[PDB]
Amino acid sequence: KSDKPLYGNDRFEGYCIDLLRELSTILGFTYEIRLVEDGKYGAQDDVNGQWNGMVRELIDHKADLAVAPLAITYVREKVIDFSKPFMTLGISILYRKPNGTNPGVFSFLNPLSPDIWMYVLLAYLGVSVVLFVIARALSTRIVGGIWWFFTLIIISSYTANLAAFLTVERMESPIDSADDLAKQTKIEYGAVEDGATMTFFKKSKISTYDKMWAFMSSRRQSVLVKSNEEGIQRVLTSDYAFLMESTTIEFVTQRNCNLTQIGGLIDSKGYGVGTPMGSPYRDKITIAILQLQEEGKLHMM
Amino acid sequence: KEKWWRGNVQNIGGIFIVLAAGLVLSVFVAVGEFL
Amino acid sequence: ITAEREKVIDFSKPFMTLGISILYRVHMGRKPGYFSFLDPFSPAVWLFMLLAYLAVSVVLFLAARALSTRIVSGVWWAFTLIIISSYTANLAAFLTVQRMEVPVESADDLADQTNIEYGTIHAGSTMTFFQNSRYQTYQRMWNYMQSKQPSVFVKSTEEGIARVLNSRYAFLLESTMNEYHRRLNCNLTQIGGLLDTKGYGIGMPLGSPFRDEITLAILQLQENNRLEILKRKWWEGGMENIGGIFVVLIAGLIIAVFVAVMEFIYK
Amino acid sequence: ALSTRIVSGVWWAFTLIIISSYTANLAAFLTVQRMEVPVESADDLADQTNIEYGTIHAGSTMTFFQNSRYQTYQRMWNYMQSKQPSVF
């Protein structure tokens, strides 16, 4: 998108355009681009038996090469030939960053470890008891001295530590593990229903994911979300942590800095360039792509 | 050029002196009152 | 399954997904207490301060012979205001610094380090994909690996774990090995993200009749979650710092009980 | 009086926490005041948020920042293309 009108090899830009440019440069090919017909990335159109979309077109051998965010799944590669993966995507958890005022009536007595304040109250009682035992002077002067030193070192330390909290803002607050967003329930382990992450949390059998399936299916009308942008909304407003795809998680988590990642990839999958089943250019593009990832240009891109 | 060139007690002492001066002046003024 | 390896025999899709990540020692906290009471000031200053309290006692006992005393009480108040204010400053310094430092780091931050020591298993694949670099951070890391000449290219992988757990010499190992020797001994720490990528996995022969079917079944075990289950199975697995003051408190209480003995005897 | 003694005690606690926290908070504002590096380096100027890297548009400065290969300068050209609403 720009001001002037153009088309074709100028009509697209971003990641996959640069990937296609470098791939046809080192491959020596003619990048005749075309957007998808049905628009969807597509799937095996299971009711109608066929594949739909980009899988249909490469299944129809119309285009030569499919260079996009397509994901090499074990149903999907039964009708095409995909390479080794361009990037390595996964399901991962997006939550709000530590917001800010996490106040409370503890924040007065926050910056000391609470056992010290408990023993401090104990020592106030004890020093007063020793003063009561002084009633059998230099005793009074020396207990005033030592007790004065004691509260001096406490109050000076507490000031220093409260200074260190108001200039070190290391929040690090929320739950950060897949099991962490599993086991608690004050967070809302939500997702985008009827898609990738819905499947790979649903169909799996890992235990942490099993409890995730429980907390998903319990509030299925409430906690499941419709669109990926709707998931961005539900993690913006409420405490609805979303479980979305890793590339979208990154491309939002360098967009609007209040949202943030939590934990690594739950599962893994391989997105990357694929072609019609039997295409001789496939392993050629594979050698190219592995050279590109060894080049650093893929990571650079 | 980047590659082959770019490699890899008395502080508060003062205020202590102020306390000394004060104590000197004190001895002096006290002897003064005595006289 | 990498570039020049791809040309001879044909590898499948990847089994797991590797990575070049830094294994570092965990920061062992800080130096602990107790007797971190007088820690913020120089020791001789605390000694001369106790001498000054004695000096104030001498000044008052010589004033035992009142405005002349009022002004020395004034100087004493000025002195303890400045010294406890300076105390709170230095303890603010030590706590703000010892919470200020980012103990973990990013990759280029690991390049910028001083006490940390980068390095890989000596003259190998990690040394390869840090050798022929073009990313200037990774390039300068290779420069420092060739530069800090003493022991950066440590030889063996178990010796890599040795140089990690023993001294502040970080290893830069393949992420599968960082998983194994991280979750096998919880003292280590996975510094950084994943500085590259590669996919290890089953490789069949030169263009042979079995790349297709084997890779099909490998993905079939990759998305029916059995590969992850197998992965987890055979792979996976202030306060007393200021405490001292309470000790000084009890000590003074005992000294005062000795003063009590003295007084009762005087009686 | 002991009934007065307790309320004097808690008044003392309240004013001690107030004074101590306020000295901490003024310490915080002053330490972050002096903590910021107002001047910067090259890649620091690349990392900025409130500063806007620019050039006399479509010129020799744009040339020797256009064909860069040093990744700091390269990312600077990326930001020169990126935040185009103001730059150049």
From Swiss-Prot, chain A:
Its job: Ionotropic glutamate receptor that functions as a cation-permeable ligand-gated ion channel, gated by L-glutamate and the glutamatergic agonist kainic acid. L-glutamate acts as an excitatory neurotransmitter at many synapses in the central nervous system. Binding of the excitatory neurotransmitter L-glutamate induces a conformation change, leading to the opening of the cation channel, and thereby converts the chemical signal to an electrical impulse. The receptor then desensitizes rapidly and enters a transient inactive state, characterized by the presence of bound agonist.
Glycosylated residues (UniProt): N99, N258
Misc note: The postsynaptic actions of Glu are mediated by a variety of receptors that are named according to their selective agonists. This receptor binds domoate > kainate > quisqualate > glutamate. It does not bind AMPA without coexpression with GRIK5.
Extracellular-facing ranges: 167-301
Post-translation changes: Sumoylation mediates kainate receptor-mediated endocytosis and regulates synaptic transmission. Sumoylation is enhanced by PIAS3 and desumoylated by SENP1. Ubiquitinated. Ubiquitination regulates the GRIK2 levels at the synapse by leading kainate receptor degradation through proteasome.
Annotated L-glutamate binding sites: P69, A71, R76, A196, T197, E245
Quaternary structure annotation from Swiss-Prot or TrEMBL: Homotetramer and heterotetramer with GRIK5. Tetramers may be formed by the dimerization of dimers. Assembles into a kainate-gated homomeric channel that does not bind AMPA. Can form functional heteromeric receptors with GRIK4 and GRIK5. Can form functional heteromeric receptors with GRIK3. Interacts with DLG4. Interacts with NETO2. Interacts (via C-terminus) with KLHL17 (via kelch repeats); the interaction targets GRIK2 for degradation via ubiquitin-proteasome pathway.
Transmembrane residue ranges: 115-135, 146-166
Tissue: Highest expression is found in the olfactory lobe, piriform cortex, dentate gyrus, hippocampus, granular cell layer of the cerebellum, and in caudate-putamen.
Origin: domain of life: Eukaryota
Family affiliation: Belongs to the glutamate-gated ion channel (TC 1.A.10.1) family. GRIK2 subfamily.
Cellular compartment(s): Cell membrane; Postsynaptic cell membrane
Name recorded for this polypeptide: Glutamate receptor ionotropic, kainate 2
UniProtKB/Swiss-Prot annotation, chain D:
Superkingdom in the source lineage: Eukaryota
Residue intervals passing through the bilayer: 10-30
Cellular localization per UniProt: Cell membrane; Postsynaptic cell membrane; Presynaptic cell membrane
Coiled-coil intervals: none
Reported tissue expression: High expression in the cerebral cortex, pyriform cortex, caudate-putamen, hippocampal complex, medial habenulata and granule cell layer of the cerebellum. Weak expression in globus pallidus, thalamus, colliculi and the reticular thalamic nucleus. Expressed at high levels in the trigeminal ganglion neurons.
Quaternary organization: Homotetramer. Heterotetramer with GRIK2. Can form functional heteromeric receptors with GRIK1, GRIK2 and GRIK3.
Family: Belongs to the glutamate-gated ion channel (TC 1.A.10.1) family. GRIK5 subfamily.
Function recorded in the entry: Ionotropic glutamate receptor that functions as a cation-permeable ligand-gated ion channel, gated by L-glutamate and the glutamatergic agonist kainic acid. Cannot form functional channels on its own and produces channel activity only in heteromeric assembly with GRIK1, GRIK2 and GRIK3 subunits.
Protein name: Glutamate receptor ionotropic, kainate 5
Gene name of the record: Grik5
Interval of the full protein contained in this chain: 614 to 701 of 979
